[PDB]
Amino acid sequence: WLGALLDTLPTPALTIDRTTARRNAERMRERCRALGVRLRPHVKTHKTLEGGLLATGGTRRGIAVSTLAEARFFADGGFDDILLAYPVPTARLEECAGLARRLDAFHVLLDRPEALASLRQRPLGHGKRWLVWLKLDCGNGRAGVRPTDPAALELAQAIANDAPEEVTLVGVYAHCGNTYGCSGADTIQAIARTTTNAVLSFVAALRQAGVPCPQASIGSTPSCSHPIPEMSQLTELHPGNYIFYDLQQTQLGSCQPQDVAIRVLTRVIGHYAHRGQLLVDCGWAALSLHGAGAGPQGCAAIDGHPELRLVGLTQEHGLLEHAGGQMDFGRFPVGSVLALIPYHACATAAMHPVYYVHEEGKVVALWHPVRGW
Amino acid sequence: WLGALLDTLPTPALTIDRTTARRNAERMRERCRALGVRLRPHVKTHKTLEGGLLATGGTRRGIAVSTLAEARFFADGGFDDILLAYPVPTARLEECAGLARRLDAFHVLLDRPEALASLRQRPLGHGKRWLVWLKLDCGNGRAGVRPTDPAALELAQAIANDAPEEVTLVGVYAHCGNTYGCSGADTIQAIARTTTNAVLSFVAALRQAGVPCPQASIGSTPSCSHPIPEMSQLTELHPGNYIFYDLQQTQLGSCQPQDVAIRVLTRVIGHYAHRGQLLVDCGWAALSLHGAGAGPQGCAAIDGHPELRLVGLTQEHGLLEHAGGQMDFGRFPVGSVLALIPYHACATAAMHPVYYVHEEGKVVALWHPVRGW
Ligand SMILES: Cc1ncc(COP(=O)(O)O)c(CNC[C@@H](N)C(=O)O)c1O
Ligand SMILES: Cc1ncc(COP(=O)(O)O)c(CNC[C@@H](N)C(=O)O)c1O
Ligand SMILES: [Cl-]
Ligand SMILES: [Zn+2]
Ligand SMILES: [Zn+2]
Numbered sequence: 192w193l194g195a196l197l198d199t200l201p202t203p204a205l206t207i208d209r210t211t212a213r214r215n216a217e218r219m220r221e222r223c224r225a226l227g228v229r230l231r232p233h234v235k236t237h238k239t240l241e242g243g244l245l246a247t248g249g250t251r252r253g254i255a256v257s258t259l260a261e262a263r264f265f266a267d268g269g270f271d272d273i274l275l276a277y278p279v280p281t282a283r284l285e286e287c288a289g290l291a292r293r294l295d296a297f298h299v300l301l302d303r304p305e306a307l308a309s310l311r312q313r314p315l316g317h318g319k320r321w322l323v324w325l326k327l328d329c330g331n332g333r334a335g336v337r338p339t340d341p342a343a344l345e346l347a348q349a350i351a352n353d354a355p356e357e358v359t360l361v362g363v364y365a366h367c368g369n370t371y372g373c374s375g376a377d378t379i380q381a382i383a384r385t386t387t388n389a390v391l392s393f394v395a396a397l398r399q400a401g402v403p404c405p406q407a408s409i410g411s412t413p414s415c416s417h418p419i420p421e422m423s424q425l426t427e428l429h430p431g432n433y434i435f436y437d438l439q440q441t442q443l444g445s446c447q448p449q450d451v452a453i454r455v456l457t458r459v460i461g462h463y464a465h466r467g468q469l470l471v472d473c474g475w476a477a478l479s480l481h482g483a484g485a486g487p488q489g490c491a492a493i494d495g496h497p498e499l500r501l502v503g504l505t506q507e508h509g510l511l512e513h514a515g516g517q518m519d520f521g522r523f524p525v526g527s528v529l530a531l532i533p534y535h536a537c538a539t540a541a542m543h544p545v546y547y548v549h550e551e552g553k554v555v556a557l558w559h560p561v562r563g564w
Numbered sequence: 565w566l567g568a569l570l571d572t573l574p575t576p577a578l579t580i581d582r583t584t585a586r587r588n589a590e591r592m593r594e595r596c597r598a599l600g601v602r603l604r605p606h607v608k609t610h611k612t613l614e615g616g617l618l619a620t621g622g623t624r625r626g627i628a629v630s631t632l633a634e635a636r637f638f639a640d641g642g643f644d645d646i647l648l649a650y651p652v653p654t655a656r657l658e659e660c661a662g663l664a665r666r667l668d669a670f671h672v673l674l675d676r677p678e679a680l681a682s683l684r685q686r687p688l689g690h691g692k693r694w695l696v697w698l699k700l701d702c703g704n705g706r707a708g709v710r711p712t713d714p715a716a717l718e719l720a721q722a723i724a725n726d727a728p729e730e731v732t733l734v735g736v737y738a739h740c741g742n743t744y745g746c747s748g749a750d751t752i753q754a755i756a757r758t759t760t761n762a763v764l765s766f767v768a769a770l771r772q773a774g775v776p777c778p779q780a781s782i783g784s785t786p787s788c789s790h791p792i793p794e795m796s797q798l799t800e801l802h803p804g805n806y807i808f809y810d811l812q813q814t815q816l817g818s819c820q821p822q823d824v825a826i827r828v829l830t831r832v833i834g835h836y837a838h839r840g841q842l843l844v845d846c847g848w849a850a851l852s853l854h855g856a857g858a859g860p861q862g863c864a865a866i867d868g869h870p871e872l873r874l875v876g877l878t879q880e881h882g883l884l885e886h887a888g889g890q891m892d893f894g895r896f897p898v899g900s901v902l903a904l905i906p907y908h909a910c911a912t913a914a915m916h917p918v919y920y921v922h923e924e925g926k927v928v929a930l931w932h933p934v935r936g937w
Contacts, residue, residue: 282899283574476914506911541849544935544936564575
């Protein structure tokens, strides 16, 4: 479809503005340069080699992934310095070890002594150590050890020193995912600040105890979009969603509408005057239901038409009302193309086997994401 | 993974009990035989050749699909008598016509004179007619013409008689999707009855007007699971979800827990005592958020453990509480496998590139679904 005009694509179609995405990627890289920290982009928003190449500024080095299928896909694509940003899967250690042996640098995360115990009973060998990060829970309420829990310091000690030829402690890793529960720069920054200070305190505690911890990593798209100076005391930031942004991030204050690279293109396929509704060929199969539970009106906005809203999604159909009761079927003929702005980029992207990547109205590339586990 | 024990699979893993699914398929076929009607299973719940083969009782004939990608996939798989159960996509008529020419019987649906007009300006040729069904709106509130709207009868007349060598009216098609908004057999049957009687009335109206309409088709999984005798006056039923069922259908009363063929297997990957939570390796990427907006507690139940409930899903993590405040970490060690029963089979299945199909504890096949548009 290279060269094709967007309104020519078969819908529903996930489109990515390459100019916007390139810009988002370069901006995050510059924020990190200004802070003096490295950027380790998380790839789970797009799951593509091409997106990885952009986020990484062409180097193919320094990413985080959320599954072993991503790890393998990006490894096969020539990436390295790959962090599996997930409690290391002790049931699949053979797969992890295969990656650790193929890659110059494959990093894993853990937060349980039994997980460290599992790594010990499956040595890598071959002059390779498990490159282990300690996952810190700093308010996220998910995985990781609490920085004020004595268990944390001891686990860090165990990872760093207890078998230095089989296992090394690369650093601590926190994810301030809680920034999603609060709107406005001020609250986002407070969470960033709490998380940053918790990490810094923990690292200071480690250095006082003699536990070598060379790296410290936090990041979420909301906090990395408006960074605080305290972040220059860390070594690495690992946001991911920012490469695309979405309506959720626009509502949070992370970005402006112009920063959202992603749309789902859909065609009007029906008028129903007796109901006041347009029928479009985008249902939850192209969109997901993210944004609904917090109904369908929250799943997407119609780009350039605030008057319209979603009022129904089935697997392959969506219903649009003017919810001014004042619909104008003449302005939206059957066959015309609307651009939906989805609530959650990661969720929408996971529904598409292909992304139509465009510049100035025309398709310039096709990106095909990996999926699965 | 053939022969493998289920607890051996890499999680999260979508599993289908082949004995349950075979049973569901044969039961629906028998209901239809008892009624004297044909079964045209909709394949969108599973989107696999293998599921199509079961639903179809081995014949590979008589299905409904929801997209041109399904149409093509099932055509390439040797199926025929395929109905595209969707307003015919007038922007992609070349694709439709390619299928109409390759297949003995490719059926399309419409509900707009302009859509019929579009079919006329793109004749099939080669001794082939567009095989057109009229979509009826009988309370569903989606697509189709209302049976009491004079426009319906005229469109049916136009399809049947206005260009009999280019276009034929195969029948009327209704989908009682509204059965999803009401629990209990009685209300489900009322909707089935309203829909059936509306269709029958419309067909009687057609015969009085001299419009040949040989087929009449309704169906949804809730109404076809407890059919009414009035349905024997139709010619065809087209449910789809019943091949798997799910928690939603169990709550509606369509099926019993034993009829649900589908699970998502997930591993406990973490204990968090200070929160009372288990961490499992199934997030929304393996589950979808269906069942949430009507929070996460509604997305799935843990098979054999009513005590547990979901309280959080991120892309790749889920959180389980005992919500008796009384968790018992000893009964759920890290590494153990739980079976989630998802809310909406179709939504969950759309998240998986492979289904692990098993009999008596062991994997017997891998089904790979098509996706996209
Ligand atoms: C047009 C059409 N025909 C048949 C079916 C099968 O219904 P069941 O899922 O078996 O009850 C459907 C499916 N219905 C609803 C979907 N559009 C959805 O939103 O999930 C159908 O649409
Ligand atoms: C462990 C881990 N590290 C980094 C990120 C990137 O965060 P952003 O999406 O860019 O804000 C994540 C992602 N977070 C939340 C997901 N688990 C989800 O539920 O969507 C992460 O998990
Ligand atoms: Cl969803
Ligand atoms: Zn996300
Ligand atoms: Zn469904």
